Amino acid sequence: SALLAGTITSGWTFGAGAALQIPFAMQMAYRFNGIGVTQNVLYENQKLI
Amino acid sequence: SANLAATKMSECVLGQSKRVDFCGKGYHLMSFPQSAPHGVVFLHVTYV
Amino acid sequence: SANLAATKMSECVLGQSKRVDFCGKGYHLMSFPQSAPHGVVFLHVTYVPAQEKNFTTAPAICHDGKAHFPREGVFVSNGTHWFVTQRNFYEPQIITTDNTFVSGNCDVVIGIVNNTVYDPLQPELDS
């Protein structure tokens, strides 16, 4: 549950160094960029997700 | 199996992977580990 | 263990790998192999950030009624002006149309703030 904490809240940086403060709406916008999806899909469809 | 599990705790949970059929089927979003007796249960959030 | 040793000689040493807790903890730069008895001592050069500062964010910037989405970067603020920086370092920049992307309106974005997007072509018309 400590690793379930920092994955949802603190981002991807908790194991690579000191923990940042990343909001959850800004996590999945940059997790779509690895698979080739921009930020147009997340912010409009956020009620459907 | 534990070295496969310690890789997927490092790659899938603590980071983002572009892989297919490693962090789960489809495009990888994030992974949620859960506690299990004599093992570990992964929850793979995928993009289909 | 030798198949895990030859994997780190191929992936970490010979090229750049994006893997986490494989080529060493943190962001991978390079790897230096060193020979030992019955093994290779690895030297992992890593990129670790240190000093952090809390900033004020927002997902989008509303200007003319259309939402301005960031292309590559984040939206930060010091409490007065909104800056465009990156995730790995602090380099404040003037907000331009080349660093922003126009999609949608301002109504469907939760948390959108109002600012003035600077167009560099507008002072260059009369000058």
Curated annotation (Swiss-Prot), chain C:
Effect listed in the UniProt record for changing residue 98 to H: In strain: Alpha/B.1.1.7
Stated consequence of mutating residue 72 to K: In strain: Theta/P.3
Disulfide bonding pattern of the chain: 12-23, 62-106
Reported effect, residue 51 to H: In strain: Kappa/B.1.617.1
Sugar-modified residues: 54, 78, 114
Role played: Subunit of the fusion protein that is processed upon entry into the host cell. Mediates fusion of the virion and cellular membranes by functioning as a class I viral fusion protein. Contains a viral fusion peptide that is unmasked after S2 cleavage. This cleavage can occur at the cell membrane by host TMPRSS2 or during endocytosis by host CSTL. In either case, this triggers an extensive and irreversible conformational change that leads to fusion of the viral envelope with the cellular cytoplasmic membrane, releasing viral genomic RNA into the host cell cytoplasm.
Protein name: Spike protein S2'
Source organism (scientific name): Severe acute respiratory syndrome coronavirus 2
Gene designation: S
